[PDB]
Amino acid sequence: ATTSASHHVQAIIDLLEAAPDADWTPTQTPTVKRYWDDAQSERGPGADMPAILYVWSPTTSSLDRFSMDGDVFDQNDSIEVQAWSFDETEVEQLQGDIVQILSEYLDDNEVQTPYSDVAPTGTNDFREQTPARTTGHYIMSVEVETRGLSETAKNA
Amino acid sequence: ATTSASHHVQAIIDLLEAAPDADWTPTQTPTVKRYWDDAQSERGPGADMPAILYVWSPTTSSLDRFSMDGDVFDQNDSIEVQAWSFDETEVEQLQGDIVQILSEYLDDNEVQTPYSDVAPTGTNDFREQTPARTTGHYIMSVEVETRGLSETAKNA
Amino acid sequence: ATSPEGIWSNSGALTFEDPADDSEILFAGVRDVTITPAYEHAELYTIDSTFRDEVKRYEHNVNVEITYAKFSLEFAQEWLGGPGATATASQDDSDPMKFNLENVTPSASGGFERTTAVENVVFPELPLDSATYGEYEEYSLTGSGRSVTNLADTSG
Amino acid sequence: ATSPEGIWSNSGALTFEDPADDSEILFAGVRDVTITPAYEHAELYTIDSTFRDEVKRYEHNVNVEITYAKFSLEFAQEWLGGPGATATASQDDSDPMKFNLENVTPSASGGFERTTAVENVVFPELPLDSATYGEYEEYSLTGSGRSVTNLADTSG
Amino acid sequence: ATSPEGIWSNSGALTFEDPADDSEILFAGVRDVTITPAYEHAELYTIDSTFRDEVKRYEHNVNVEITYAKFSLEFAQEWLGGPGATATASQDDSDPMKFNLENVTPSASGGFERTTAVENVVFPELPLDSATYGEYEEYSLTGSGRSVTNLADTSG
Amino acid sequence: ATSPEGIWSNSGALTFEDPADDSEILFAGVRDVTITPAYEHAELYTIDSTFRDEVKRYEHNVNVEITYAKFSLEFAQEWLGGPGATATASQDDSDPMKFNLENVTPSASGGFERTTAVENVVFPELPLDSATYGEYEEYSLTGSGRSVTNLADTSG
Amino acid sequence: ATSPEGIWSNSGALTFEDPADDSEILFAGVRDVTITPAYEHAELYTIDSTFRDEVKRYEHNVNVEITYAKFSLEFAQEWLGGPGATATASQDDSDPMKFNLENVTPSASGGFERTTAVENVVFPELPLDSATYGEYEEYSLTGSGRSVTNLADTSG
Amino acid sequence: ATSPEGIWSNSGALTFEDPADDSEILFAGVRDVTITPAYEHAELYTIDSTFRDEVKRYEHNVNVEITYAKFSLEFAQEWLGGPGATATASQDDSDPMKFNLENVTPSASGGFERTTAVENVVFPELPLDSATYGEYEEYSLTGSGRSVTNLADTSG
Amino acid sequence: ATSPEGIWSNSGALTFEDPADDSEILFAGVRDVTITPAYEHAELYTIDSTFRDEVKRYEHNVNVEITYAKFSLEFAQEWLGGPGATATASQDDSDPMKFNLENVTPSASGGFERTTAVENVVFPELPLDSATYGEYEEYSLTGSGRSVTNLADTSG
Amino acid sequence: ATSPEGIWSNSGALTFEDPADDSEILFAGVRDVTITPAYEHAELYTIDSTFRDEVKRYEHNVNVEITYAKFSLEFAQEWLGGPGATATASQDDSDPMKFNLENVTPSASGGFERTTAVENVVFPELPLDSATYGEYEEYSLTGSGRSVTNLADTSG
C-alpha cells in the first residue's frame, strides 16, 4: 500500500516521506534523501532550511533459506537513517520522531509495507564529535532492520 | 547441462549468460565478465553501453571430509557478483535480477549445474560510496554460495 | 484449496474470554503461544499379523502453553476466583476457572487469516511472581482446553 | 546392483494423499523429515547357551517425524475431520485421519531416485499455533504409518 | 479494569514474617524469586464422549522458589528451631518452621503495585554452606506455602 | 605380545555380508562405527561378607551402532525382505534380516591390523529418509549381533 | 538481630575430626562445599478441604557434597578402616567411618562468623583416583551427617 | 602424618595383571581414570527420633572407569577368553575375565606416591571398534573390582 | 459368513429398559462393560474309559458387570423400588428390580454392528456412594441376567 | 427425570448423628467413602428349564465403609459407650452403638445434589490407633446399616 518499492532504502524513504506533518516534533517537516543524493561538502542542511535525513543500507542483507521447498528467502535487510542539523536538540527530537514513525509498521503481514517487519533496532548519538568553535552539523542516527519472505522463481 | 564448467567462477558466469533477454529487467541484457577481465581505470561500463557484471571468488573454498570412506569432498564455494552502472535504478534492478536468476538451480542434483546447491546468500548496496558531485558508477552486489560432492583420487 | 504459507508470529493477536459472558479478560505481552490438539491413540495388534489391524483415538484435549511478560491482575484474580467470580486470595473450592481462548493470525502474505479458538482452557498452576535480578519478569503457563471450537480462514 | 550414494536433503519432494480418493492434501515447507520403519524385536535365551538362540520381529510401524514452517489449513481441517471428511472444530469420534505419505528424492549424483511411500500415517497430536516472538512459526509432527508400500529406484 | 503491564524484577521488596507475632525475620539479597499457586487437576472421561466431561481441582499449594546471596543467621536458626523458637542446632521434633512470605512489587510503569502474600511456607531443606572457589556463596530454597492470603493492587 | 597402539578411524573398512551366500551387500559412507561386545553380569552377595562372593556372565550380544551418509537401496531392500530375499515394501513376517558384518582396520603405525567380525547383526529399526534442509541426509543405525566370530591381527 | 550479609567462599576453612578423639583428620584443597540440612515432609489433605490440613517433618539428615583437589592419604585410610582404625585395603565389616565436620566462615564485611558443625558424616563412596590427562586430579564426595550440632555467630 | 597434596594426572602409571600367573596384560594410552570404592548404605529410622539411629555399610565394590586411545589385542582377547585363557571370538561360558588393576602416582611435589591396587576387576562390556571420521579412535571401560588390595604411600 | 473384526470399547452405547413399559432408564458414563453368558457344565466319567463319556449344560445365566462414573438417580430409585415402582428409601419386599439391557457397538472397520440384548438383569447390590479422594466417584455393578435375547449384526 | 452426571469425591460432606437425640457426632477428614445397599439373592432352577424361573431378595443391609485421617474422641467414646452413653473404656454389654449416617454431594455440573442417608449403622471394629512411620494415622471403618432411609435430589 504505502511503498511497494523494490529495495529497502527506497521503502524507508517512502515511509519517512508518507509521515504526517503533525507527527514531527519540530516547527517544520524534515527533508528525506538517499545518502548519495548530496556531495560531502554540501551534506547536511544550510541555515534557514529544515533538517535533513540521509538513508542507506550500511551492511549486507542476509538471504536465509526458509525451507526444503526453496520457495522463499527469509530476507533480513539493514538500514541506517542519519538526522543532520545545526540544533543539538533538533537532532534529538528527530531521533525520537524517526523511532516513533518507524514504530508503526512493526508487524505488517505486508499490509502497508512489502515486509513482515520494519523495526528500529538501535540508535546512535554523534553530538560528541561536532567541535565547539565552528558552527557545524550535529548528527544522530537510527539503525533499522527489516524482515520478509522474498520469492525465488525456483518453482515457476 | 547448462554449464559443465570446471570451476565455480566460470559456472556462475555461464548461468548468468544463459539467462534469456526476457528475464532481465532493463531493456539491454548486461555484459558478464570476470573481475580481472578489465583494468581499474576502465572498469564499469561507458555511457551508451549495457551495464556490467563482474564475477570472482572472494573467499576460501572449503573441502570438508564427507565420510569415513574418503571417496568424496563436501565442497563449499563462495562468489561475489558486482553490478556496475551510472543508473542507480539499473543497479537495483540488476541486483534483483541476479537474485531471481541464480535462484533457479537452488537445489539441483547436478542436473543443470555441476552442483547440489547454488544460492544467493546475501546482497550488498554500495550506492552511498559514489560521490554525488561527479558522474560515476554506482555498485551493488550479490554474494552467492555453492555446494556439492567433489570426487577424490583415493579410490581410483 | 488455500495455498499453505509461512506465518510471522507477532501478527497473531491472542485474547481470553469469560465463558459466562463472552466478555474479555485482559491479558497481554505474549512471547510464545503453543496450541496443540491431541488425542490418545490405541493401535490393535494380534498374532494374525505384524502389521497394525486398527487404530483409534480417544481422550481428546488441546495443550495450551504460553510464555508472556506483561502481568495481568485480572487474569490472576479470575484464576483464583474460579467460574463466575474474582478473588484476592486462594479459594477452597473444587472448580478451576475456565477460559475461552482465541488466537487470530494473518498469514505472512495476508493469503489467509487463521482463527483458532479453544473452549474451556484450564491451568493447573499460575505463576504470580517470576523474578530474576537485572531482568523483567517473564511467566510460563501450561493448560488444557476441552476442544477446538473453530479453525478457519477468516479473511474476507 | 546400484552403488550407495549421498543425498541432498532439499531435493526431496514430499506429498500427502487422502487414501480414499487418491487426491493430494496440500502441505509444504518442510525443514526436517525422518521416516523410520521399525519392529519390536524379541530374543530367546535359555540356560543352554549365553548366546542368543533365536530372534523374531513383530509390531511393524513406520515412525514419521516432520518439522515444517508453512501452515496448511487443509491438512489441519483433514486431521480434525477424520477419514473421508473435513471439519473446522474438534470431532467427538474415534477414527483418526489416515494420510498416505509419499516422498521422492534423487541421489546427489542423480545415479538413482528413491521413492519412499508409507500407508495410513496418523498423528496423535497436531500443532495449530506455534508462535515465538521475532520469528516465523515452526511446527512439528510425529506419527505412525502402518507400513512401507514402496521403496524402489523410480529413476528411468 | 487495570491494564496488563511489564514488571522490573528488582523493584520487588520481599519479606518473611513469623506468623505467631507478625515480626519480620531478616532476609535479604535474592537473585530469583518464583511464586506459583497450583492445584492438582482431575479430568473425567467416559465411553460416551472422547472430549473431557468434567474437570476439578484439589491439593492446593503455592510453590515458592528463591535464589539468594546474603546469608541470614536468623532465618536459619528459625528454620532449625521450628515454630515459636530459635535453635543453634538440629531439633529432634516434628513441626517445621512456617514462614509467612510477602512480596510487594510495582509495575514497570507504576500503573499498579501487586502485593503477593503467602501463608505457612515451609522449606524441606535449607542450605547452610554453599561455597565455590573464587565466587561468593549462593543459596537456593524450595518450599510449599499453604495458600495465597493476598493478591491485589496496593497502590494508592 | 603385540604393542598397543592408537588407530586412525578412517583407515577402517566396513563391509556387510548375506550369511546365506557370503555375498557382499553394498553399504558405504560411514561416519561413526561402534562395535561393543557385552554380557549381563550377576554378582553374588550373602550375609557372610560385604564383598562379592562370585561374579558370572550371561546374555551375550554385540552392540553395533553406525552413523552413515551414503544411502544404500540394496541394504534397505534386504532389511525389508528378511533372510534370503529383497522387497520393495514392508513384509508381514516374523524373521528380521541377519547381516554378517566385518570391519578391518590397520593400526596407526601399521603395527597390526585388527579384523573384527560380528555374526547375525539385526537392526530393530531402519531409517529411510533422514532429511534436514540445507544438509546432506545422515542416518543412524542401532543393532545387535549374536557373537564376535573373529578378533585377530590380520597383518602378515 | 545480625544483619544478613554476602560471603566470600574462600574465607571458609573446612576441617574433619575423628569423633572418638576430637583429633583432626588431615584434609585440604576444597573447591566446592555444600552443606544442606533436610527433612522429609508429609502434608495432610482430606475431603474436607483443598488446602493442606497439616504438615510435619521426619527423617532428618544433612547432605554434604564436597569437591576437592588435594588428595589425602589419611582421610582415605580412615574411610577404609572404619570407626577407630585406619587400613591400607578394603575392610570386610559393616560400620562406615563417621567423620565429624566443621566449616568456619567469616562474613564478607566480617559482620559475623558462621560456624557450621555436622556430626557423624558418612560417605557411601570415595574416589581414590580421578585422573584426566593434562589436568590435576579432582575429587567429588557425596555423604550425609546425622545432625547439625552447631550453627552460630562465632565473632567476639 | 602425610600432608594432603595435589596430583598431576599424567604422572600416573597404570597396569593390568592376570591374577593367575601375576603376568602383565599390555594396556596403554589412558585419558581418564576413575577408581571409586563404594558401599551401599542402610540407615535405621524409627518413631523414637527424627534423626538417624544407626547406619551400616554392605555390598562393597570398586567402580573402575577408564577412557583410553590405544587399542590392545591382548586385553581384548583376554576379555573374550575368560579366566586363564585367550580367544579370538566370543566364548559361550559363564566366567568373565578378572583383571588385577594397579595404579601408581607421585604427588605434584613428590611428597608421597599413592599406590592404588584393585582385585578381580570385571568389565560387562568391551568396545572393539569406536571409529569416528576425522579422528583417532577412543574407547571406554566401566567395571567392578571386588575390593582394594592396596592403598598406601610406596615412596622411600 | 461375516469376518471377525476388532471392536473399539469406546464405540459402545449401553442402555437399560424397564420391562413393564420398554421405557428407557437414564444411565450413562460407563468405563467397563463385561457381558458373559454362561452355563454350569457336568462331565460324565466312569471306569470304562479315562476319556469323558458326555458333557451337558445347566443353569444358564448371563454375568453382567459394569463400571460407570456418572451417577443416575432414576437407575438407583428403580433398583430401590423393585418391579414397576420407584422409591427413595429401602423397600422391605422380596422382588428385585429386573432391567432389560442392550449394548450396541460398531465393529472397528464397520464390517458389522454387534447388538447384545439381555433380559431380566438383577443386581444384588447397588453402590450409592463410591468416593475416593482425588477421583470422581466410580461405581461397579455386578449382576445376573436370565438370558441373551438377541446377539446379531444390526448394521445395514 | 434428571440427567445422570459425574460426582466429584472431594465434594462429599459425611455426617453422623445419635439416633436418640439427632445430635451430630463429630467426625471429619474422610478420604474414602463407600455406601452400598445390598440383598442376598436366591435364584430358582428346576429340571423343567436351564433358565432361571425366579429370583428373590432377602437379608437386606447397607455396607458402609469409610477411610478417614482425623481422629475423633467423641466418635470413639460413643462406640465404646453403646446406645445413649459415652465411655472412656470397653463396656461389657451386648448393645452396639447405632449411628445414623448421612452424606451429601453436589453433582459435578450442579444438575442435582444427591443426599444418601442410612439408619442404624454399626461397626464391628473401631481402629483406635493406626500409626505408620512417616504418615498421618489413617483409620478404616467397615459397618452395616439397617436400611437406606433416604436417597434423593436435595437441590433447591
Automatic annotation (TrEMBL), chains A, B:
It comes from the Viruses. This is SPP1 gp17-like tail completion protein. The lineage of its organism: Viruses, Duplodnaviria, Heunggongvirae, Uroviricota, Caudoviricetes.
UniProtKB/TrEMBL annotation, chains C, D, E, F, G, H, I, J:
It comes from the Viruses. This is Tail tube protein. The lineage of its organism: Viruses, Duplodnaviria, Heunggongvirae, Uroviricota, Caudoviricetes.
